[PDB]
Amino acid sequence: AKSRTIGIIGAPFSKGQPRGGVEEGPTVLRKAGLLEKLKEQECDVKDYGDLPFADIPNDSPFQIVKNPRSVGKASEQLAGKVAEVKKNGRISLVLGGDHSLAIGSISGHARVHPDLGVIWVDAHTDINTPLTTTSGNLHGQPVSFLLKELKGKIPDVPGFSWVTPCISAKDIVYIGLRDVDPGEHYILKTLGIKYFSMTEVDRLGIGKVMEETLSYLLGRKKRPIHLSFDVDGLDPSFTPATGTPVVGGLTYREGLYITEEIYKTGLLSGLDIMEVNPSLGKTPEEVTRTVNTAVAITLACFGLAREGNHKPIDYLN
Amino acid sequence: AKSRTIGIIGAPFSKGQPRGGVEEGPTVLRKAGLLEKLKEQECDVKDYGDLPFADIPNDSPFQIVKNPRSVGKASEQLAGKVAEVKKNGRISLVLGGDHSLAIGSISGHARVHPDLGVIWVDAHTDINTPLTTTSGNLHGQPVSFLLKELKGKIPDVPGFSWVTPCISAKDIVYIGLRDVDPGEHYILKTLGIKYFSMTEVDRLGIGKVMEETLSYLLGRKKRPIHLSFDVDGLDPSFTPATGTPVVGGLTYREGLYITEEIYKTGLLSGLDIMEVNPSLGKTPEEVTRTVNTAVAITLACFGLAREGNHKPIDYLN
Amino acid sequence: AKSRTIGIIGAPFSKGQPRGGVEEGPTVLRKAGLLEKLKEQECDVKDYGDLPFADIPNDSPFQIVKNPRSVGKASEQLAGKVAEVKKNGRISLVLGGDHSLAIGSISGHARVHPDLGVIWVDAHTDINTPLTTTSGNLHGQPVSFLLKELKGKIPDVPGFSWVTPCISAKDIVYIGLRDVDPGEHYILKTLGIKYFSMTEVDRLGIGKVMEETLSYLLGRKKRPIHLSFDVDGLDPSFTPATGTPVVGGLTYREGLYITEEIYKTGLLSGLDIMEVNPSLGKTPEEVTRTVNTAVAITLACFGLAREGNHKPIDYLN
Amino acid sequence: EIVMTQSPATLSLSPGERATLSCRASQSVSSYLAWYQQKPGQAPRLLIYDASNRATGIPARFSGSGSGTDFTLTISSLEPEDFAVYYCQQHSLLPRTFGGGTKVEIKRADAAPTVSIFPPSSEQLTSGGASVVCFLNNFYPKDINVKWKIDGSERQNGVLNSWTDQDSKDSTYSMSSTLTLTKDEYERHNSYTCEATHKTSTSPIVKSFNRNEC
Amino acid sequence: EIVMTQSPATLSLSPGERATLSCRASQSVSSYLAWYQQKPGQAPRLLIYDASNRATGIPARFSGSGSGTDFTLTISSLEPEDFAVYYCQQHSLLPRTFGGGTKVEIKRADAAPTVSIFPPSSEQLTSGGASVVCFLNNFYPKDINVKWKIDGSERQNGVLNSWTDQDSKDSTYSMSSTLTLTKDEYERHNSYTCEATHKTSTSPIVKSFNRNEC
Amino acid sequence: EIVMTQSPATLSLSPGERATLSCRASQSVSSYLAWYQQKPGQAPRLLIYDASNRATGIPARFSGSGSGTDFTLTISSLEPEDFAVYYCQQHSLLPRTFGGGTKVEIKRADAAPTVSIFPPSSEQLTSGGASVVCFLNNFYPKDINVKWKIDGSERQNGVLNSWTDQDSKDSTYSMSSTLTLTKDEYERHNSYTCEATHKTSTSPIVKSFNRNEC
């Protein structure tokens, strides 16, 4: 079909976030059988393999931003691979890794579709700049390299000379915000980005939130949707094996509802599954719940509705 | 009263489902004191005892359907007992066991009330036929022996010669579907059965779901409601000690709300509590949570609202 | 500011409830750094210290009400301290302890503001009288000493000669009722108190519940709101280390939404955090979840929205 | 976890005046603890439920006090049916420790033990064993050290003792000194001594016998 | 947790008639248990899946019955390739216990062991050890008690035994009596006896040798 | 769980040139590990935080490298205050193992131990004990095997050794050979030998004394 024509891109990258172990991001999501669980329903799954990320030895940090050149080279290599798999007319399923890859994962998507809209499901806004950060981790700064309105408030970070800001402030939607910096909230209220924090999700309910989200992005003109999904945006009772978990998150029901309503538009054109960290589960059962949750989110992005699916032939024979 | 006049029918039956241990269905639900917890509020509880289910030795299976004669004889014996307790003007509380008993538990109910409506709260549709199944377990095929529209797509399974299809496709409501077969979803969309899967429950909320359910069944004409409740339809964080748990289910709040809104119609006329399996809790605490959940669901079916209940006399004396 | 000008009053008191250990109520909530977590955002926090509660030796009980004189003297001392901190124009953050302190914590608040409205977030109504109780614990009877309509149905309990009934039946709102006595439900339906039990919270959703609550109290006239928050009203998966936990409670999301909507009125004028019991967690992790939940509830009462907060200066410098 | 300590470990008071006991807590239990009357071989009967108030069927004399760290139990009218081990129990902190034991004995003029010894039977020598038991009967108080010796060189790790409860009439005690040897170690030596030591005995009483003497 | 008990612990039946076995449950497994054919050194091959129905590649003769407490396994056409340990497995209760073992032997006229002994090598005396092994070859049935003695005074805690599987042709058994002593304890004594006892031996066969005799 | 291995287990380099160390990981820690300077009896001072960059108060000479499996620690300007055990710590994988220990000694021309022995005091014989300690003073390097003998027959399970840190001035070591015997085992034998063995000693130095000789 037009949708559920997946090109998987692994990206085992960890040098944005401190908790080392998300390098087993694509390894664990593939060994849980994401490919085989996609291949029952009509999914033309083509694995493009994990990317080879080199190890730059003299990775001298910025003022607070640390490992800048490795993240810049990793996102450039990823943006090249995403532009390759979107010239094949597929849906760029990227799965890492950490949110530092989403710079390339949205830039390479915007090399083909310049009018995309990002549904950034995350506990955090990830909209810190290299001037307003406190951690300096680049899993907290992917959005501020991508917004067109933040051109000029971004210093020339080494390794990010290729990054062209590709989306505007009114073309991105946050769902699930519950841990926002003061600098992040000031940027989020200055630019006027439509965000659905957990206050609005508790108020309106996930049905009204997804209805207003799809009306905000797709109400004016049908355009590609790039769901960039984080696994700490869901509640840590469902995904405890993530990098920066924040309690009081989206329930597993509500996450599956978000992905089902994105699928029923039929305009999904890129999926990002970041911050899966299998080395942080206190039991292997916690890792099992995290990975089964992320696999179920991806499968509900690509057609598996909870009400059931049937192939269009008669079964009473 | 007219409602909360309970006739309990135990049914310790297991030969529909593979996980042996649901034979301690009525034993554990009675030793948790369902009778005594009913007898505070005005409940004319009459225990009709567990049924004696014989062991047919030459239980030769069908093609895929396995143990057919034991399930057929068990449901015939149960339908006789349910018709007996509905000639006494009570509410046929049946509690097993597994969903394979619901064939008799709805057929014996329809021998007295031919115009009943089934609220089938389950994680699954249980609408597999003997031709479209994959497991062949008869806890996944009780509905397809009961629907009038599936007369002709059902082979003469041995032991089920007595089964007359008793309800129609527009008189049954599913609440909580999140694991549906392709054959089950094809039957569910061909017959046009009004179903509320977890997509619609996440969208509308359980208030709008129960309002549309009671308007769908009781909006045209007041008629007996037969809530056939499964304990895997609730989320496995609340009932982990069940047969086939599927994650992302109805919360304990939402299950109690369903049963309270069924009670406030005053038209409940049969309750089924199936698939309780005390031998599958990894701790006894898991079994304790499962059985306390199922007991609280039954008590909220028979009058125990969470807002509180008082006997109609003055208490300030 | 007018709001988030906190005067903390500790109250390590336990002689209303049986489970001894809530005397480490203010000790554990302060050693988790409630003061320091308030002092980032603009909170003029002034610690008024724990109160010295004497030990009356001849604490002869009533008929069923037990330890009456200790609770009466404790609430008189607390009401004096709350009237002191409300003459300083602060918000009387009281944190115990148990609900038996809320007699003084609302009476001393009503010595300054006679027209307050109590949002009583609790699993229970706590509206038992000394004549209609069964436990006789005074953590189940704070409301019935405070209501003006129950003057005459209250015997002269020793130690409570000072208690003047201060609020009316139509100026108190219950949110989260799921364990109500028959005497409590009879009083709750006779007086006509607007209550939002878990049936109505599951029906309307917490957005509609908080909207109707603030329209019920603040719709006629702007007046001080005294949120008296219990930690068993939240679900025991989030606060297991409480005195009388009742399953199926408000989620942590919904509790934070209640406190955020109380803050955005800007009319919060007293907060009570009762029934925190750190000696009942089966693990120290359970105590850690309970205390982090109660601290997050208090912080969201005093300005910490989940969408984020920024100081009103430019951060892009 | 609160250790509950009782200051009279043992107690011996004649039927008569007050016998006030002690139960000290390690924290502030704050008038929430109890008292018990475990007779030997019985269920622990409840005395006091929360530091006072004389729980439901207590005769006239078992009042106590507290509030809130070191508690008392007064036995004002001693009544010699009450000779039992008393336990204090904290309840309003988990886990729920008890006291230690407050064995109220009988107080008489100190009795001398009848230090008597017996050889093993010749029936036991036909089995291959040798159990030499020195019986000490009718003594008060309890404390007796008994020393067994290999013809004068002391014995260890075979000595067993069985103390009685205090007798109803003479208020004394009784004790076996169960020493079990082999058939071979029996036949090696003759003089098997029972060096007993009681407070009434100014000298350590040594009761002995030779092998095949009687 | 259900203990599954098998009533024939061992079994010896000649190639021929029926060899009906037993598997008793401690509860009602109710026609949900299985049967297996673990040959020695192999994977346990499945015989019967749920109390009957002859699972998928069984030749002609391994029918069983049950439903639901004490089950049977009939070997109607015995077929001497089937000499293996059989296991019954309950499945529809957790945890999933098996049976005990049903070692179907070969049934012949009882063979006498060739009780033969060997000294340690002089090579082993140059190492500091002494391994005295008495080999018992070609006996049936299995049960032999072997007694080692220090010139007539019995030996313990150095005796090791290695039993064979039953042989294909003569259907007998073989056994070493591996006794290991030191170099010093070897040179202290001479007559090293192998007191063997088989059902064919009316007297206990004692095979011995002196030190440095051969 | 990643085992962190250090290839120089010990190290002895004179104050002078480079002393490059090793820390090999069992996985790819990937430029996320650290270095430490635990002096004896001190807190482990931080050297390098993430494979380089010289953490905040290091003088001039403790650069390192890595990225990402086998790492180095260069001591280019050795500076003899730096004689301490060095530890490498992985951090970006849990649980957080350290290295093994990299005891940088002092490198001089190998010193002979002064093998000296002492009897127990007569004061100790009035207590019932016998502690025979052979003191070996001022040796380099560490490795000495000391053998105690019962008049020529070796002693076990009573020998205790106390090694020093390397001395500041002569860069040598010192060692007691604490052998404790009873009063009875003391009086049974006379010649109490201290068979010491150092690399400077071509023959094993045996220091002895007779009982009541001095």
From Swiss-Prot, chains A, B, C:
Changing I9T: In ARGIN; 12% of wild-type activity. It comes from the Eukaryota. Changing G72V: In ARGIN; 9.3% of wild-type activity. Keywords: Adaptive immunity, Arginine metabolism, Cytoplasm, Disease variant, Hydrolase, Immunity, Innate immunity, Manganese, Metal-binding, Phosphoprotein, Urea cycle. The modification N6-succinyllysine is found at K15, K73. Substrate binds at H124, T125, D126, I127, N128, S135, G136, N137, D181, T244, E275. Binds 2 manganese ions per subunit. Homotrimer. Interacts with CMTM6. This is Arginase-1. The gene is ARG1.
